[PDB]
């Protein structure tokens, strides 16, 4: 059992620098038979360097293999956006063999203030007797940002999943939206639902709230 | 939240109104107030003749249902009032049109 | 080199999933040449199921063992798999891949199918109304929004249009997301505020090509002139 | 360093409660003060004056709140305007008397 750990897990770079990719294992690698991945969301992985150190066919002279033992760097020169994918190493003397976690490389970008909304649930909604109260977040960088609910000043926990969108192919920036499922008899105890959204680029904390049968 | 007619009100100078050399010039005022929703629409007419110049309308401002208030101020001269000139303040919200004439008879 | 995968698209939990690898091409007689399958769970990392190598060869996974088994058929030249006992937290989507030797491993990667293992059936999708209560911030532009819920699997496609069938370009469209066994997902479309404050259409349509209904809600907007 | 203008607005003859509006036009500096009179007495409720706007010149509105039957009565309204020490009283009255 050789356990691979990747870090970072997100790094920002920009394109046409130097990219490198740190891999660690748990512990030696015989004849360092460690391969390199590459992966893009929607298609299929793709085979780049076999062995750390051979390239494979129909892929770049730009990415370079370099280390031995418990310690491999990827390194690749001429940084394009189509690469800003995720990438996995892979050994594969261990037989069973196991993979890492992957690390994702994103477009460096400035810092923009996000748009928060709320829509309350729908009145055909509440017939069903489940109601979703939602919190949207558009047009924010970097990526890592706190969402928390508070209803009637309680602040909630263990109820809120949070999907996150990918990267803008030509915004660069991020999307995510959180969603607030309470019961029916829950929802009519409660008047002002809430969610928070704090930002790296706000000086104070925004807070939007709505109030029960306005809407 | 509500629907409401909007009010029409018309503002004309007295007969010591006018000043300034020859020629002497005056203006009009139509106010619409306690109408909902924001949007509304101010227009002037001159003996039916759609007014395209000389007049400005000052931006929409907040004065429970919500309330607007919208005030236009249009330049007319002392021969077309001294003519019996009507002037009618046209005012579009929602489809609805709300005409108001005034006159200087008595 | 290519590789295609095919299988069932819904199995319930606590039952046999069988899957096969179509590949065509080559032969599994010389020396270093296998067939792995690897598996990917939505927001997590690749993981190694098993792998073959020639000779009837196999190799398991200590933390799988005892519950896979690889069995391979030179005739029709595809690898059966056989998974049992099944779990919702072991949804993913299985990939096989070919090794042209020793050091070259998985050179060629097929397209893959996603498993998905719901207790619940595959249902209609249905839509829910969203409109913002926004106030005291007009802000660049309003939002409006499209509660797609109860719908297996995971395959929409999101198209906006006005009152009088327009074309809209949102592109805004967030991930599901699995709750109580089934996928929710959420999205929205931006809109400029003056086309807001013009034409007399107070309503769009949203449209949704799902395999299981055609159903297409409207959402009323809230208008802000 | 100009004198402002001052105008009065009066009610239509043929009917129109209503409100008078004494508008000050092309005055410099900006801070102004209106007040309203009536017959002569200082008026203490009633009126109010609206925030300064710009038209450099400036534009500045007053309402005051009247009564049909005491408009019509003959009551002498006047217009007060202070701006750089100087004090301006225009008096309207009605046309059709
Ligand atoms: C459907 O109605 C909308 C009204 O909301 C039309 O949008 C207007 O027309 C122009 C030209 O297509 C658009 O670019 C603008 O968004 C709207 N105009 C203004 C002044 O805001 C839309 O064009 C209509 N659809 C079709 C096919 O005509």
């Known amino acids: 059992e050789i356990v691979l750990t990747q870090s970072p897990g997100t790094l920002s770079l920009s394109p046409g620098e130097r990219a490198t990719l740190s891999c660690r294992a748990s512990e030696t690698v015989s004849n360092d038979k460690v391969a390199w991945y590459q992966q893009k969301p929607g298609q299929a992985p793709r085979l780049l360097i076999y062995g750390a150190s051979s390239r494979a066919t129909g892929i770049p002279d730009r990415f370079s293999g370099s280390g031995s033992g418990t310690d491999f760097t990827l390194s690749i020169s001429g940084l394009e956006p189509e690469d800003f994918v995720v990438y996995y190493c892979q050994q594969y003397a261990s037989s069973p063999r196991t993979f890492g976690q992957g690390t994702k490389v994103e477009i460096k970008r400035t810092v923009a203030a996000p748009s928060v909304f709320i829509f309350p649930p729908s009145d055909e909604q509440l017939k069903s007797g489940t109601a979703s109260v939602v919190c949207l977040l558009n047009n924010f960088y970097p990526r890592e940002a706190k969402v928390q609910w508070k209803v009637d000043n309680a602040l909630q926990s263990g109820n809120s999943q949070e999907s996150v969108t990918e990267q803008d192919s030509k915004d660069s920036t991020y999307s995510l939206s959180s969603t607030l499922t309470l019961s029916k008899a829950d929802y009519e105890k409660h008047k002002v639902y809430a969610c928070e959204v704090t930002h790296q680029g706000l000086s104070s904390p925004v807070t939007k709230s709505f109030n029960r049968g306005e809407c | 939240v509500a629907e409401m007619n909007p009010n029409v009100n018309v503002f004309v100078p007295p007969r010591d109104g006018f000043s300034g050399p020859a020629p002497r010039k005056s203006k009009l005022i139509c106010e619409a107030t306690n109408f909902t929703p924001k949007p509304i629409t101010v227009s002037w007419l001159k003996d039916g003749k759609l007014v395209e110049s000389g007049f400005t309308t000052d931006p929409v401002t907040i004065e429970t249902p919500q309330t607007y208030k919208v005030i236009s101020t249009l330049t007319i001269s002392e021969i077309d009032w001294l003519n019996l000139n009507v002037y009618t303040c046209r005012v579009d919200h929602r489809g609805l049109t709300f005409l108001k004439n005034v006159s200087s008879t008595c | 080199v290519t590789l295609k995968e095919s299988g069932p698209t819904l199995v319930k939990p606590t039952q046999t999933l069988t899957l096969t690898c179509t590949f065509s091409?080559?032969?599994?007689?010389?020396?270093?040449?296998?067939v792995g399958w690897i598996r990917q769970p939505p927001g997590k990392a690749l993981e190694f199921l098993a792998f073959i190598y020639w000779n009837d060869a196999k190799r398991y996974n200590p933390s799988l063992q005892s519950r896979l088994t690889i069995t391979k058929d030179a005739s029709k030249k595809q690898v059966v798999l056989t998974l049992t006992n099944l779990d919702p937290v072991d949804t993913a989507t299985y990939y096989c891949?070919?090794?042209?030797?020793?050091?070259?491993?998985?050179?060629?990667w097929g397209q893959g199918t996603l498993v998905t293992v719901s207790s619940g059936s595959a249902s209609a999708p249905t839509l829910f109304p969203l409109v913002s209560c926004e106030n005291s911030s007009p802000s660049s532009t309003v939002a409006v929004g499209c509660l797609a819920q109860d719908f297996l699997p995971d395959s929409i496609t999101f198209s906006w249009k006005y009152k009088n069938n327009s074309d809209i370009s949102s592109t805004r469209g967030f991930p599901s997301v699995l709750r109580g066994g089934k996928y929710a997902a959420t999205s929205q479309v931006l809109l400029p505020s003056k086309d807001v404050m013009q034409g007399t259409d107070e309503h769009v349509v949203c449209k949704v090509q799902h395999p299981n209904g055609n159903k297409e809600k409207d959402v009323p907007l809230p208008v802000v002139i | 360093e100009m004198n402002p203008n001052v105008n009065v607005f009066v009610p239509p003859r043929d009917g129109f409660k209503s409100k008078l509006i004494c508008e000050a036009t092309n005055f410099t500096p900006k801070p102004i003060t209106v007040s309203w009179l009536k017959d002569g007495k200082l008026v203490e409720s009633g009126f109010t004056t609206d925030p300064v706007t710009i038209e450099q010149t400036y534009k500045v509105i007053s309402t005051l709140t009247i009564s049909e039957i005491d408009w019509l009565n003959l009551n002498v309204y006047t217009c007060r305007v202070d701006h750089r020490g100087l004090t301006f009283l225009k008096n309207v009255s009605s046309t059709c008397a």
């Open positions: 891949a070919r090794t042209s030797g020793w050091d070259i491993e998985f050179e060629y």
């Open positions: 091409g080559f032969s599994l007689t010389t020396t270093g040449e296998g």
